Every structure is written in structure tokens, then in C-alpha cells.
């Protein structure tokens, strides 16, 4: 047959690419020689086309002007600080070690200095639970308990824009406009509505999948469709 849609994706053609050229900034923690002295002033609050969430423009003492992954509650004028000795208030960034356990955090680094990887979407947050001289245990929004180097920097507070998911799109048109701001092919045609040549679920006098939908982890691309390595399906039990 023909390569299935999931395979066209990888080639990275226009249709599957994100409108990068239309994006604003790659949100990452600033680099500080040391000392922490680094502080700056919120100059404005903008909309981030890549995350459908607000972002804060900040002017730093040493002249640097960069957009920042804004937590909820940051306003123009506020003074943010980044470093080991940063005060402990929302919007400030400092290593997990210097952060008091029990405090909600966002934009957490996977490894010290990577600029933040975890908890960055609308209204989410990580939860610093345990400290140590060797391991900082954080609970990520997925519920998992992650062990991190206490040297990993983070931002205090939860990400701005919480509750975005609460309102339904209501109409195809709204999805449309959102989708146009992401690296995604939309709308979605069901495999079972295709021809046998286009998808392992395609074909038939009526619409139904050919075999069972749970596919092995070892299935090859072109065949790995449906419920991938499902440990279970349905809702019962």
C-alpha cells in the first residue's frame, strides 16, 4: 500500500511543520555567572503564539531584554530575580535546593542549566516535596515522582493561563484557528474511513478495524496504529 499519515509526518514538510517563523521566543532560564545579583523589571505581558498562554517581557539590570515563561500573578513593574540568593516569591527563579519544600514550581530543568523542561503549559505546576544534598524529589503534573539534581533551577508559582481547557471549542472553526498555530495536520480522518491501501484499518463493506486495535511495541512504522502497547483498554475494572 501507501505510507500511512504518521509516516508522512516525519518527512517534516510544510503541512506538518509548526509556523516557527511566527513564534516569539524560546523560553529558557537566563544564565548567571553566579552571585544571584541578577534581577530585572517586568516591562510588558504578551501572548505566546506557541503555547496559547501569556508570557512576560523583562528588562534585566545588565541591559538584557528577554521574554520569560510567566507564572500566574506577574504584573508590569514587578521585580523578578534569578540566582541562588533570589528572594522566594512568585516569578523568581532559583535552584530547587534553595526552594522551600511544599512550594509550587514551574519550568523545571531536567539537568542544571538546560533552561527548564518540565511544567510549562497553561496553569500546570510541579510540586517540590523532598530535599537532600544529592536528590530533589519533585512531583510533575503527570503525577510522577521525579528525582532531580538540587542544582536544577526552577520558577516559583504555577504557569499563567490556568483553566484554558475548561471552555469547549464549540465549533470546528475555533479548533481550526488554534491548530493553525501548531505543528499539526488537522482535521483528522479516521483510519477505518480510509481504503485498505491507506491504512491497516482501511477497507471493508462497512467501517470497522480489521484486526484488534492493540498493537505490539515492536510493530514497525506503517503498522503501529490504534492502541499502542496498551496495558489495558476500556473503562471496566
Amino acid at each position: 500500500g501507501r505510507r500511512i499519515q504518521g509516516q508522512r509526518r516525519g518527512r517534516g514538510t510544510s503541512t506538518f511543520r509548526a509556523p516557527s517563523h511566527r513564534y516569539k521566543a524560546d523560553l529558557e532560564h537566563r544564565k548567571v555567572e553566579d552571585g544571584d545579583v541578577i534581577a530585572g523589571t517586568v516591562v510588558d505581558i504578551e501572548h505566546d503564539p506557541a503555547r496559547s498562554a501569556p508570557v512576560a517581557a523583562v528588562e534585566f539590570e545588565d541591559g538584557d531584554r528577554r521574554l520569560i515563561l510567566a507564572p500566574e500573578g506577574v504584573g508590569v513593574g514587578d521585580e523578578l530575580q534569578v540566582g541562588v540568593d533570589a528572594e522566594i516569591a512568585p516569578g523568581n527563579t532559583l535552584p530547587l535546593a534553595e526552594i522551600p519544600e511544599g512550594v509550587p514550581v514551574c519550568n523545571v530543568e531536567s539537568s542544571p542549566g538546560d533552561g527548564g523542561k518540565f511544567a510549562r503549559a497553561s496553569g500546570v505546576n510541579a510540586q517540590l516535596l523532598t530535599h537532600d544534598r544529592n536528590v530533589a524529589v519533585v512531583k510533575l503534573p503527570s503525577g510522577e515522582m521525579k528525582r532531580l539534581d538540587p542544582q536544577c533551577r526552577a520558577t516559583i508559582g504555577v504557569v499563567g493561563g490556568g483553566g484554558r481547557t475548561d471552555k469547549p471549542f464549540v465549533k470546528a472553526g475555533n479548533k481550526h484557528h488554534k491548530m493553525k498555530a501548531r505543528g499539526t495536520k488537522w482535521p483528522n480522518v479516521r483510519g477505518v474511513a480510509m481504503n485498505a491501501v491507506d491504512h491497516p484499518f482501511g477497507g471493508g463493506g462497512r467501517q470497522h478495524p480489521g484486526k484488534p486495535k492493540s498493537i505490539s511495541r515492536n510493530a514497525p512504522p506503517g503498522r503501529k496504529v490504534g492502541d499502542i502497547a496498551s496495558k489495558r483498554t476500556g473503562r471496566g475494572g
Binding site: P54, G157, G162, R164
Partner: protein, 73 residues
């Protein structure tokens, strides 16, 4: 509110659009000053027409249940 939708989309969809948007459009009390002059400037962005204070808040509410837990902890 949801009345712009006519008889389309069904109960839940538009009841929630009205609910969200009514809270959304409510008078909100500015964090800097204390006046109820906070209006939504866009997704997650809020501002006081009184003092001009521009804040980061929820998407349809200036404050979220989680943003409040922060203040405490």
C-alpha cells in the same frame, strides 16, 4: 452570552460558554490598587483600566484555584 449561538451546539457547550464568559466579564478587583476595574486583555492577560496594571492570571479568570494556593505555601 451564549445567545449569539442561536439554537446551535446544544445545552452543555453553550451553558459552559455563558458560565465561563459571565465570570470572565465580571468586575474584578485589581491586585495593585483595590478597585474593581480589571478587564481581560486577551488569553491569560489582565489589566486595570484605573491604574493600567497589567497582570498574568487564569485564561478566563484573573485568579485560579491554583494561583491562590501559591500565595499560601
Amino acid at each position: 452570552r451564549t445567545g449569539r449561538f442561536g439554537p446551535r451546539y446544544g445545552l452543555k457547550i453553550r451553558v459552559r460558554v455563558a458560565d465561563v464568559e459571565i465570570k470572565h466579564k465580571k468586575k474584578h478587583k485589581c491586585p495593585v490598587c483595590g478597585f474593581k476595574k480589571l478587564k481581560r486583555a486577551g488569553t491569560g492577560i489582565w489589566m486595570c483600566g484605573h491604574c493600567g496594571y497589567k497582570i498574568a492570571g487564569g485564561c478566563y479568570q484573573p485568579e485560579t484555584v491554583a494561583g491562590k494556593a501559591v500565595m499560601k505555601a
